A and B are shown apart, each in its own frame.
Chain A
């Protein structure tokens, strides 16, 4: 069951930017629900809606799908929202869809957990999502850090530990991201012996592979040797491949041949 607004409180603040799905139009416009903040209803007057001319009303309203939203005035005493679709720009739309995805993913994971446990989903956001959004600024980034670091769940009080286990398993199953760094080096040697030099250099390159990062010097051609590594954090692969580059240059600068680089390490 979908409830327990993703953000902190029930009533949207002033000038906060949200995302609304059209639900019902009488004459004045889109008095509809929010999908980023609380699901409380809010007015959307038609003049607050259209930048172009108002030609196709039905093609424009698009009931059943989310759209941008800027809040202008809030009812904080009985509950209503003054919300608009005119105070937006494209670069604003970008962060709008960003926040849309950010809230959707956390709602999906915690809705799965609350559906499986039959534990009221508001208790899930109380016990889990809100402390993570306090520590780390957003529960999505907190889940991403949980995938690498277990410490995020310390100091936080489970409603039951099986909740922790199921959440860990599901975030590991769906939020699994490790990026491949590949480089390309031309052997341009015109010399006497390079094949044995290639043996030495590639043995040295593959021995540098760590237990968590196995660099594999694969063959795709005679000059072009390719270098692939699975960067686990995406900061050490560049220096690993730089070490391999130093190795290849140092090997071939003495036998008499020449080697040159085309593609440095890039994710």
Chain B
């Protein structure tokens, strides 16, 4: 005689709920798998890659259950520009009597510590092995900088391929090669379309996929047939994620930083502004233990041009009002997870795609903006993403002086001009600010066929720093 809502509240209470994070715990002892961290933040970032019009977000909603907005009326159907964020909790069940493959269970961010076992007849409770975040990268030919930024923030990969379509999909190859560029060898291949398939056709496509991945960097990548609409083979992907992907080294010794990819103004309309909030920047902490009430500055920040034409950068200092992660407001942030840093920053500053690929540093560190940067570049033999109708995939030409090139350092989408080209190094001038922290893997893309085309990889070697104006 109980409502579903009263029920859910009951088994949420019986599951231990969602405990509040402590104000000040012992950080020298915390691991990304402490029960304190896993319940209220994601420690592993997983990205999704695939061909256009494939349904990457559909697999994400099958796994977690949180939608990816898909906004802007026009972009409600075709393609979205920003990333796709959803939170999944990997619940294993402690009873070994039930079969291992259906033990694993992925649930939304709102799930409890120990909710009951949905399998009929099993009295076990789920234990949360890890909370993970999901980034749905774009899948189109024009949007490339956001994809590469997502790959840079990615820690694990999920490749999606459809079966009955043509076997050599070049968008998938471009995604995998870009993931290879930014030091990611943890990829799980996913066969999206298996229901409308024959027994021999699936085997032939599997053979084709296995033949495809022989000469690339990634060798031992698993392949899983999942159904995005039928909502099955969900536990298999979760157990594969648990097994093959370990934790990249990210501890508390490394200095704190932030890399903002998305911005979120907080200006709830219609109500009086006497009750208002700040402005949220969606950024990832690849290194750093950030807490509530800390000083931070956006390194490239305010971009201005004087009467002489010189580019001036005013780093945007700001006091962190709040940090948003997982579901509840959290006191201290765990590196290895997208976080909304909600600060006293201006409402307009976070309005549009403005804080897309910028570098932010806490008070107590000085990242350097650079105006001219020396890069060490390497490049492939043929472009990926060009469907040649039976003729020798376009072979890439060597770079030329005075060429506009889209250079993605980390997450920043900058247009560099070539000053010098050499055998294995090059010199780039940035009309848009970029900053150099430590190593910061880079990707290079050219204008060859109308739209952007990835060519190779690069690393920052030298540069001409610009001292910020106080």
Contact = CB atoms under 8 A, between A and B. Distances in A.
Direct A–B contact in complex, judged by CB atoms less than 8 Å apart: yes
Interface of A: 186-196, 198-199, 202-203, 206, 216-223, 225, 257
Interface in B397-419: none
B316 A191 contact: yes
Contacts of A194: 344-349
Interface of B: 265, 267-274, 276-279, 301-302, 314, 316-319, 344-351
Contacts of B270: 218-220
B166 to A, nearest CB: 44
12 contacts: A187-B348, A189-B346, A190-B348, A191-B346, A195-B344, A195-B345, A195-B347, A219-B270, A219-B272, A221-B267, A222-B348, A223-B348
The CB with the most chain B CB atoms within 10 A, among A195, A196, A206, A219, is that of: A195
A188 B348 contact: yes
A199 B346 contact: no
Contact of B269 (A193, A198, A220, A257): A220
Contacts of A203: 274
Nearest to B277: A195
A130 B316 CA distance: 72
Contacts of B351: 221-223
A219 B316 CA distance: 24
Contacts of B319: 193
A27 B271 CA distance: 69
A194 B350 CA distance: 12
A252 B316 CA distance: 16
A225 B348 CA distance: 11
Given A192-B317, A199-B276, A222 B350 contact: yes
Contacts of B267: 219, 221-222
Given A218-B272, A219-B268, A189 B344 contact: no
B347 A191 contact: no
A193 B347 contact: no
A198 B276 contact: yes
Given A192-B318, A193-B318, A219 B348 contact: no
A192 B345 contact: yes
Contact of B347 (A187, A216, A217, A218): A187
Contacts, number: 87
Contacts of A220: 269-270
Contacts of A217: 273
A190 B347 contact: no
A195 B346 contact: yes
Contact of A190 (B276, B344, B346): B346
A47 B24 CA distance: 100
Q: Closest 6 CB pairs between A and B?
A: A222-B347, A194-B346, A222-B265, A223-B348, A189-B346, A190-B302
Given A217-B273, A222-B265, A257-B346, 18 more contacts: A187-B347, A187-B348, A190-B314, A190-B316, A192-B317, A193-B344, A194-B349, A195-B344, A196-B344, A216-B272, A218-B273, A219-B268, A219-B273, A221-B347, A222-B267, A222-B350, A223-B347, A223-B351
A189 B348 contact: yes
B316 A192 contact: yes
A186 B348 contact: yes
Contacts of A257: 346
The CB with the most chain A CB atoms within 10 A, among B272, B301, B319, B349, is that of: B349
Nearest to A257: B346
B311 to A, nearest CB: 14
Given A192-B344, A195-B345, A221 B273 contact: no
Nearest to B347: A222
Nearest to B318: A192
A42 to B, nearest CB: 60
Contacts of A202: 273-274
B268 A195 contact: no
A261 to B, nearest CB: 14
A200 to B, nearest CB: 11
Contacts of A222: 265, 267, 279, 347-348, 350-351
Nearest to A259: B348
Nearest to B265: A222
The CB with the most chain A CB atoms within 10 A, among B268, B316, B344, B350, is that of: B344
Contacts of B269: 218-221
Nearest to A202: B273
Nearest to B349: A190
Contacts of B273: 198-199, 202, 217-219, 225
Contacts of A206: 274
